[PDB]
Amino acid sequence: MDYIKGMTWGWIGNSEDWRSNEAERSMEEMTNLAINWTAIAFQGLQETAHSPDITFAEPPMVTDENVRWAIAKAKSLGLSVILKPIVNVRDGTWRAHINFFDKDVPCEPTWSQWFKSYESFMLHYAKLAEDTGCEMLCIGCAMVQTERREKEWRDLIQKVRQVYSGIITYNCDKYQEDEVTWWDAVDVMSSSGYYPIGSWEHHESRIKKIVESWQKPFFFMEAGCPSRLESGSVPYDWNKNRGQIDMDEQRVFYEEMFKFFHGQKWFYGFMLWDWPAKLYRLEDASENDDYCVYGKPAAEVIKSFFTSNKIAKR
Amino acid sequence: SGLVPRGSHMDYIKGMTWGWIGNSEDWRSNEAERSMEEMTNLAINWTAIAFQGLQETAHSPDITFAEPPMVTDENVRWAIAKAKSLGLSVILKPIVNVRDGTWRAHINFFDKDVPCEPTWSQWFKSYESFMLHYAKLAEDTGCEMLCIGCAMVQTERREKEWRDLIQKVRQVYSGIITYNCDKYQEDEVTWWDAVDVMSSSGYYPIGSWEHHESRIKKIVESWQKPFFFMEAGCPSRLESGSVPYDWNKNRGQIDMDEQRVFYEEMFKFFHGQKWFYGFMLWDWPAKLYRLEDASENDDYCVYGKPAAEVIKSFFTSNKIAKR
Ligand SMILES: OC[C@H]1O[C@@H](O[C@H]2[C@H](O)[C@H](O)[C@H](O)O[C@@H]2CO)[C@@H](O)[C@@H](O)[C@@H]1O
Ligand SMILES: OC[C@H]1O[C@@H](O[C@H]2[C@H](O)[C@H](O)[C@H](O)O[C@@H]2CO)[C@@H](O)[C@@H](O)[C@@H]1O
Numbered sequence: 001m002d003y004i005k006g007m008t009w010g011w012i013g014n015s016e017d018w019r020s021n022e023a024e025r026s027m028e029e030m031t032n033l034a035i036n037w038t039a040i041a042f043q044g045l046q047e048t049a050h051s052p053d054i055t056f057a058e059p060p061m062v063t064d065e066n067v068r069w070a071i072a073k074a075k076s077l078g079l080s081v082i083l084k085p086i087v088n089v090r091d092g093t094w095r096a097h098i099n100f101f102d103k104d105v106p107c108e109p110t111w112s113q114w115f116k117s118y119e120s121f122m123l124h125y126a127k128l129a130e131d132t133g134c135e136m137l138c139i140g141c142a143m144v145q146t147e148r149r150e151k152e153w154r155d156l157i158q159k160v161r162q163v164y165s166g167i168i169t170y171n172c173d174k175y176q177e178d179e180v181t182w183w184d185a186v187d188v189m190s191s192s193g194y195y196p197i198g199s200w201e202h203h204e205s206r207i208k209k210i211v212e213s214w215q216k217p218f219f220f221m222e223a224g225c226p227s228r229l230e231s232g233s234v235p236y237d238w239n240k241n242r243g244q245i246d247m248d249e250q251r252v253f254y255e256e257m258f259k260f261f262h263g264q265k266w267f268y269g270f271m272l273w274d275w276p277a278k279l280y281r282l283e284d285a286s287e288n289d290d291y292c293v294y295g296k297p298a299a300e301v302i303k304s305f306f307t308s309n310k311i312a313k314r
Numbered sequence: 315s316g317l318v319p320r321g322s323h324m325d326y327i328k329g330m331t332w333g334w335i336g337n338s339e340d341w342r343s344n345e346a347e348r349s350m351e352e353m354t355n356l357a358i359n360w361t362a363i364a365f366q367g368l369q370e371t372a373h374s375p376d377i378t379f380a381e382p383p384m385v386t387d388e389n390v391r392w393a394i395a396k397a398k399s400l401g402l403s404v405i406l407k408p409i410v411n412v413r414d415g416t417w418r419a420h421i422n423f424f425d426k427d428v429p430c431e432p433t434w435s436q437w438f439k440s441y442e443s444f445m446l447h448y449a450k451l452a453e454d455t456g457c458e459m460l461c462i463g464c465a466m467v468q469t470e471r472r473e474k475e476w477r478d479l480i481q482k483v484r485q486v487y488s489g490i491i492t493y494n495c496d497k498y499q500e501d502e503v504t505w506w507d508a509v510d511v512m513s514s515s516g517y518y519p520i521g522s523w524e525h526h527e528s529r530i531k532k533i534v535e536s537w538q539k540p541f542f543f544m545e546a547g548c549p550s551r552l553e554s555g556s557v558p559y560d561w562n563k564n565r566g567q568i569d570m571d572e573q574r575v576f577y578e579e580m581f582k583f584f585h586g587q588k589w590f591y592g593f594m595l596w597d598w599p600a601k602l603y604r605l606e607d608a609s610e611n612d613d614y615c616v617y618g619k620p621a622a623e624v625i626k627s628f629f630t631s632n633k634i635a636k637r
Contacts, residue, residue, distance in 0.1 A: 049372070050420050091414075096431075097373050099422060101467055105498040107517075107559055108419075144424055175428040194430075236430055 001167070001188060001217040002080065002135075003314030004269035005306040006037035008222065010070055010277050012088070013042020015059060017277040018066040024073060026279040031077050033299065034306040039082040039138065039221070039271045040070045044121050049093040050100065052113035054121045056085070064128060071132040082136040082169070082221075082271060085125040087118065087143075096173055099145035115152045119159060126164040137164055138221055142173035142192060150182050157185045171221035174236055178210045188268065189214060190221035193261070194236035197252055200260040208266060217268045220261070224273035224291045225253035227298070243289055247296050254293075254301040263310045272302065316538040317589075319510035323490050324540040325403065325458075326637035327592035328629040329360035331545065333393055333600050335411070336365020338382065340600040341389040347396065349602040354400050356622065357629040362405040362461065362544070362594045363393045367444050372416040373423065375436035377444045379408070387451060394455040405459040405492070405544075405594060408448040410441070410466075419496055422468035438475045442482060449487040460487055461544060465496035465515060473505050480508045494544035497559055501533045511591065512539045516546035516584070517559035520576055523583040531589060540591045543584070547596035547614045548576035550621070566612055570619050577616075577624040586633045595625065 007030050010018060017023065030038065044056040057064060067083075074081050087095055100111045122139055129137045139160055140146075147153070153170075160168060169188040172180050177191045189211065195203045211218040225235035229244040232253045261267055274291050285295020293299040305311055318324060330353050333341060340346065353361070367379035380387060390406075397404050410418055423434045445462055452460045462483055463469075470476070476493075483491060492511040495503050500514045512534065518526045534541040548558035552567040555576045584590055597614050608618025616622040628634055 048416075050416075093371075093373070096424075097422070099420070099468065101419075102471075103499070103502055105496075107497055107557070145422070148425075173428075174430060176426070179426055234430070 001268050002036070003311070004037045004219045004271055005035050005311070006039060006082070006269070006271035007033055007035050008039040008041045008084070008271055008274035009074070010062070011041040011043075011274045013062045014277065015061065015063050015066050018062055018070060020278060022279065023070075023277045026275065026277055027070070027073050027077065029279060029294065030275045031079070032303070033272075033293075034303050035079065037080045037082065037135075037271065038074045039084045040067065040074065041084040041086060041274065042067070043086050043088045045088055045090055046098070046117075047090050049089050049091075049095075049097040050109065052100075052109040052117050054087055054117045056121050056124065067125075067128055068132055071134060075133070080135040081132075082138055083125055083129040083132075083134045084138040084141065084171075084221075085121060086141045087121065094142075096142045096144035098143060111149055111152060115149070115156065119156055122156065123159055123163060126160045129166060130164045134166055136167040136169060136188075138169050138171050138190070139186070141171040141221070142176075144173050144176060147172070147176075147180055153182050154185050157182075169221060177207055177218075183214050183216060187217070189216050189218040190271075191218075192236070193220035193223035193257065193270070194225075195257075196235065197232035197256055200256045204260040204264075208264070211266045218266065219268035220270050222273040223257060223270050224293075225250045225298075226289055226291050227293075227296050228289050238291070241289075245287055245289055247286065247298075250293065251297040251301055254298045254305075258301065258305045262305075263314060269311075269314070315510065317540060319490055319540070323488065323510055324591050325360070326634065327360050327542045327594055328358050328634065329362060329405070329592070329594035330356055330358050331362040331364045331407070331594055331597040332397070333385070334364040334366075334597045336385045337600070338385050338389050341385055341393060343601060345602065346393075346600045349598065349600055350393070350396050350400065352602055352617065353598045354402070355626070356595075356616070357626050358402065360403045360405060360458075360594065361397045362407045363390065363397065363457075364407040364409060364597065365390070366409055366411040368411055368413050369421070369440075370413050372412050372414075372418075372420045373432065375423075375432040375440050377410055377440045379444050379447065390448075390451055391455055394457060398456070403458040404455075405461055406448055406452040406455075406457045407461040407464065407494075407544075408445060409464045410444065419465045419467035421466060434472055434475060438472070438479065442479055445479065446482060446486060449483045452489060453487045457489060459490040459492060459511075461492050461494050461513070462509070464494040464544070465499075467496050467499060467502075470495070470499070470503050476505050477508050480505075492544060500530055500541075506537050506539055510540075512537060512541040513544035513594075514541075515559070516543035516580065516593070517548070518580075519558065520555035520579055523579045527583040527587075531587070534589045541589060542591035543593045545596040546580060546593050547616075548573050548621075549612055549614050550619050551612050561614070564612075568610060568612055570609065570621075573616065574620040574624060577621045577628075581624065581628045585628075586637055592634075592637070
């Protein structure tokens with residue numbers, strides 16, 4: 001299994017953004033992080049957390065051609081690719097709340113309905129990932145309230161294996177590394193490393209014990225922090241202190257994360273969050289509140305970490 | 315206790331729910347008194363005084379209650395006293411609704427406590443303040459029964475918290491406790507032993523009632539508790555009888571006969587069985603439409619519709635009046 005030096009590209013997955021002349025320049029600029037991987041991330045959509053139907057590849061979401069382009073462009077840039085189709089909820093609910101009754105009842109949509117819709121979604125992109133030679137497929141992201149549906153997840157993974165021959169991971173949410181009973185069904189364990197400033201040493205200890213109990217490769221499928229006042233205390237909170245710029249907060253987050261998670265032989269690195277298809281101008285970086293590190297001191301932390309000899313050795 | 319709640323805390327319920335959704339301005343109108351009086355002509359001996367509390371979303375921990383536009387404690391004392399002045403026994407039914415429109419059965423939190431999310435512990439503390447406020451009001455006003463929840467499906471697996479809440483309720487409220495499970499869920503609640511009386515929402519489709527009588531009879535016999543319907547009803551709308559629970563189905567498409575048929579079937583299969591303790595019907599508004607408007611009204615309400623006559627002949631029939 002490769003050590004991942006990664007940046008996520010393309011989120012939220014807007015066809016008009018991905019087809020702009022600006023998208024190619026954005027992906028080229030991302031290579032200056034000294035990454036060898038990118039996660040091509042884009043959304044699918046369902047109306048509510050309790051509705052069974054997932055829409056994908058319809059305006060304003062990415063076309064299959066947009067996706068083929070992003071994968072081919074990344075690979076042309078010498079990057080290995082994780083394809084990362086993510087379901088979002090149109091009403092704004094966090095996808096971790098997607099959930100149905102344990103008991104099938106005639107008056108409600110069922111797990112079986114939602115899983116059929118999720119299978120259509122994920123198998124569509126699994127076939128794309130096969131056709132385009134994606135090195136890895138991420139079959140879900142922080143789907144916390146679905147994870148107890150163990151038979152349905154294992155049945156989905158078996159269908160994925162029949163159409164996709166690359167590496168499979170599932171991205172569990174922050175704090176959830178020990179809560180997935182079906183890690184054995186994927187190749188590589190992964191989680192969202194949005195752990196607050198001051199907690200990384202504790203989480204390195206906690207996660208090491210989980211990964212050694214499973215004896216499987218682990219890496220962070222997401223990790224990052226907005227360049228905002230006190231974002232480092234809640235790096236996952238994309239709504240905290242919008243417009244309140246703090247470059248140094250984001251830098252401190254990255255320096256601590258890499259102090260504790262580096263070269264350990266059980267650890268396979270970082271897919272960072274994230275890098276837009278339409279990138280702001282360098283001159284606007286110092287006033288930008290995004291997760292993106294472009295033009296910010298955290299980018300230099302990432303570059304020196306990814307080019308350092310201990311990490312270049314993995 | 316089993317088939318009979320302990321003496322210190324079973325009647326056959328002939329009930330109609332009153333006051334929903336629980337708007338202070340509606341309850342304080344002159345019309346509220348006339349509405350409740352008119353309800354007694356159903357030959358009911360019980361009413362459920364039903365009103366909402368609110369939380370923002372299905373995944374937020376804070377419940378607001380007794381703030382505009384919701385019912386004041388004085389509005390509630392009034393409805394309970396008026397009902398009792400009319401000879402009715404009272405079920406107090408505080409119900410949590412979600413401001414964003416989400417069905418309360420989806421109210422839910424992560425099984426694992428995590429630093430980044432609201433916890434079950436936070437929601438149960440807010441739910442306890444809500445339900446203990448009304449449990450104390452039920453005690454002060456002498457309500458015969460308290461319903462401690464309604465179709466909270468995605469909370470029901472939290473057995474320790476539900477049993478802990480019920481023990482706190484027992485400390486402030488000495489009457490009969492019921493919990494109203496959702497349609498189809500009668501066998502899915504693991505803590506029925508902690509309440510006095512089992513109850514469900516009887517919104518079963520036309521053509522299914524014989525089947526549900528058999529299904530429910532076996533569930534009730536396995537628990538050895540009294541059972542009744544804490545809700546049951548059907549809108550007077552085209553094809554409502556196929557989905558009696560669906561308050562959004564075919565609005566403004568009037569069908570008096572569909573509601574009538576629903577009631578006739580329900581009473582054909584659920585009547586006088588000794589394990590069964592009757593019906594709290596859904597529902598009756600604080601502000602009642604005029605009789606002359608009844609034939610054009612699409613609500614659950616039976617006032618001025620053929621279904622009212624099915625209900626009255628059922629509730630006054632000697633078989634039922636002797637329970
Ligand atoms: O879901 C849309 C928002 O995503 C945000 O990034 C999230 C993302 O959902 C992801 O899957 C993860 O687990 O947490 C990330 C960091 O908060 C932002 O990109 C935001 O702008 C989007 O609206
Ligand atoms: O919740 C507001 C709506 O309630 C409806 O009646 C429901 C009610 O929520 C109840 O607890 C139950 O289990 O089902 C009832 C019948 O659908 C209607 O009164 C509707 O008008 C309200 O908007």
